[PDB]
Design a protein around this ligand. Structure first.
Ligand SMILES: NC[C@@H]1O[C@H](O[C@H]2[C@@H](O)[C@H](O[C@@H]3[C@@H](O)[C@H](N)C[C@H](N)[C@H]3O[C@H]3O[C@H](CO)[C@@H](O)[C@H](O)[C@H]3N)O[C@@H]2CO)[C@H](N)[C@@H](O)[C@@H]1O
Ligand SMILES: CC(=O)c1cccc(N[C@H]2[C@H](N)[C@@](NC(=O)N(C)C)([C@H](C)O)[C@@](C)(O)[C@@]2(O)COC(=O)c2c(C)cccc2O)c1
Ligand SMILES: [Mg+2]
Ligand SMILES: [Mg+2]
Ligand SMILES: [Mg+2]
Ligand SMILES: [Mg+2]
Ligand SMILES: [Mg+2]
Ligand SMILES: [Mg+2]
Ligand SMILES: [Mg+2]
Ligand SMILES: [Mg+2]
Ligand SMILES: [Mg+2]
Ligand SMILES: [Mg+2]
Ligand SMILES: [Mg+2]
Ligand SMILES: [Mg+2]
Ligand SMILES: [Mg+2]
Lengths: 70, 101, 88, 119
RNA sequence: UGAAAUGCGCAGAUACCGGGAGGAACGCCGAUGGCGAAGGCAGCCACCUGGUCCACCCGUGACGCUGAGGCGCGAAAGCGUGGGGAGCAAACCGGAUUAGAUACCCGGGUAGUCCACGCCCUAAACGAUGCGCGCUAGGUCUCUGGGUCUCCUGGGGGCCGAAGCUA
């Protein structure tokens, strides 16, 4: 569909507290989205996943969700 | 000293009595390990993505700090002895990598 | 680690003249520094075999430099190794 | 027995059987059925038709407790699955939501030989 | 499970919710990707630590390459001592299948798989390709530096291919 990167302005993707931003990079099942979807550079996507994994331990982001209407 | 970032998550059902007592048991430990405290933040209450310690929310501290590296694990050990202290995550500071200019 | 104040101090402390950053005497000096940090680290971390290779390379490269020196200037050789305490 | 007007339908599709269990909205089971509880035994419990009948049986037993609507929650892939769902929907019993909640390791325990195959 | 049976279940199993213990492994990210000399390395954090790339062209002044032997590393399985043991599982105990079935399938299950220390030193340890250096068209995709950032210039991973080589 349309890339998640393209729907945002600047943002520090080292920022493991900005759950508002971070959360659009997760799927409806709280799974880290692949680059095909996130629209990221390899290097960026590496840094992302790292800080997504931080948010998660902080309690700020989900490790999982359940799929609604299936 | 390296520059670090100390996230603490607290029990969301506290009152000035303990909350403020915790916050200084913290200051004592931070100080007692050599932690100068630059910036500090406190968004405080917030909705967790999954329950921590049976409870659906958490109270969020965040401290920027400079301090001696040979102790930073020791400090972290001390912080979580406490019971209303639920998550401690000490993290090296980092230049903000940004995206989309 | 080895911070550049620590390191600069070791370059001054040797260095034939002001500005000598390369050269046998300095190079051996720096290597001797790291070898010692890294010998210290493995005294505890017996299992850290990967690091231990690093050591072998450093050691050989140092031994290689000193071979060179002792051949060119047998004096400032005896001076260097005495000043650092080694290779006996 | 008690009157509960809505609660959960928990479908457990597996390649060997669908088992449908119905509960109050706190998760305590009211009734339950399976391919075995219907006539079937052995390989036939696996069928989608077995699924329909169990879904329907367990929905009937549940309307005996005056059940009106359910939150559906599916787990496992299995022949009977969308069939078990389609049953509930068309059973009188009203289906508020449907939710896949199939449990999955964040790779953890070694599988049995049969389920390693992806090795 | 092809179909079954052994097996577990009215000492109440299965499915469902709540609490607790433990062991082991880290899903998405994840790649045609990265790192390491090889073996090999994957949740997150901190400390300790090895390698390596680019820019400046500042320093030393051939200090280089290779390397019998030596020394060290060396997947799995295996061994010793002591822990640990959730799941999996040689052997083994059963159920099927079969003409038979010391197997393939199902149900159990010990060593082991896990940790520490000490052994073992093997492999389709494979790129089945010794290390180092110079030289000889390009095109295309990718990881990672620098620039005057359309394009240029390093380092690394692929694909097609000049000259040439090859049974
Ligand atoms: N995950 C921990 C790390 O693993 C390494 O080794 C340690 C651990 O992995 C290893 O296992 C620990 C053990 O500490 C402890 N006594 C029992 C505990 N169950 C184990 O836990 C750990 O290993 C197992 C392996 O799956 C799992 O629990 C989990 O992956 C991990 N938490 O034992 C080692 C020390 O007891 C490194 N030594 C170190 O970086 C750190 O302990
Ligand atoms: C597959 C089928 O129709 C059928 C019929 C008669 C006998 C059997 N026997 C089967 C028998 N259950 C067999 N298992 C098997 O095929 N599975 C798919 C579990 C077993 C290991 O001995 C087999 C391989 O021998 C078998 O396939 C026959 O070959 C299968
Ligand atoms: Mg069956
Ligand atoms: Mg439970
Ligand atoms: Mg390999
Ligand atoms: Mg020069
Ligand atoms: Mg000169
Ligand atoms: Mg070995
Ligand atoms: Mg082994
Ligand atoms: Mg043993
Ligand atoms: Mg048998
Ligand atoms: Mg078996
Ligand atoms: Mg078993
Ligand atoms: Mg090749
Ligand atoms: Mg190239």
């Amino acid at each position: 569909k349309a890339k998640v990167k393209a729907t945002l302005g600047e943002f520090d993707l080292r920022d493991y507290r900005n759950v508002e931003v971070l959360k659009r990079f997760l799927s409806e099942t709280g799974k880290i989205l692949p680059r095909r979807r996130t629209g990221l550079s390899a290097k960026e996507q590496r840094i992302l996943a790292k800080t997504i994994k931080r948010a998660r331990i902080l309690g700020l982001l989900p490790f999982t969700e359940k799929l609604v209407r299936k | 000293m390296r520059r670090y970032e100390v996230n603490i998550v607290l029990n969301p059902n506290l009152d000035q009595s303990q909350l403020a007592l915790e916050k200084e048991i913290i200051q004592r430990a931070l100080e007692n390990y050599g932690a100068r405290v630059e910036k500090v933040e406190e968004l405080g209450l917030r909705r967790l993505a999954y329950p921590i310690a049976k409870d659906p929310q958490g109270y969020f501290l965040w401290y920027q700090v400079e301090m001696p590296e040979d102790r930073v694990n020791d400090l972290a050990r001390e912080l979580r002895i406490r019971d209303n202290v639920r998550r401690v995550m000490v993290v090296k500071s980092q230049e903000p990598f940004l995206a989309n200019a | 680690p080895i911070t550049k104040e620590e390191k600069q101090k070791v370059i001054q402390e040797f260095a034939r003249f002001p500005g000598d950053t390369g050269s046998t005497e300095v190079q051996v000096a720096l290597l001797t520094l790291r070898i010692n940090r890294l010998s210290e680290h493995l005294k505890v971390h017996k299992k850290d075999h990967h690091s231990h290779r690093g050591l072998l390379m450093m050691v050989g490269q140092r031994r290689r430099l000193l071979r060179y020196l002792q051949r060119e200037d047998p004096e400032r050789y005896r001076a260097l190794i005495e000043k650092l305490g080694i290779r006996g | 027995k008690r009157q509960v007007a809505s609660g959960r339908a928990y479908i457990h599709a597996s390649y060997n059987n669908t088992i449908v269990t119905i509960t109050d909205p706190d998760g305590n089971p009211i009734t339950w059925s399976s391919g075995g509880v219907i006539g079937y035994k052995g390989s036939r419990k696996g069928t989608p038709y077995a699924a329909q009948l169990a879904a329907l049986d367990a929905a009937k037993k549940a309307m005996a407790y005056g059940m009106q609507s359910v939150d559906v929650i599916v787990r496992g892939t299995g022949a009977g699955r969308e069939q078990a769902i389609r049953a509930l929907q068309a059973s009188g019993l009203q289906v508020k939501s449907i939710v896949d909640d199939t449990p999955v390791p964040h790779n953890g325990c070694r599988p049995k030989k049969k389920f390693r195959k992806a090795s």
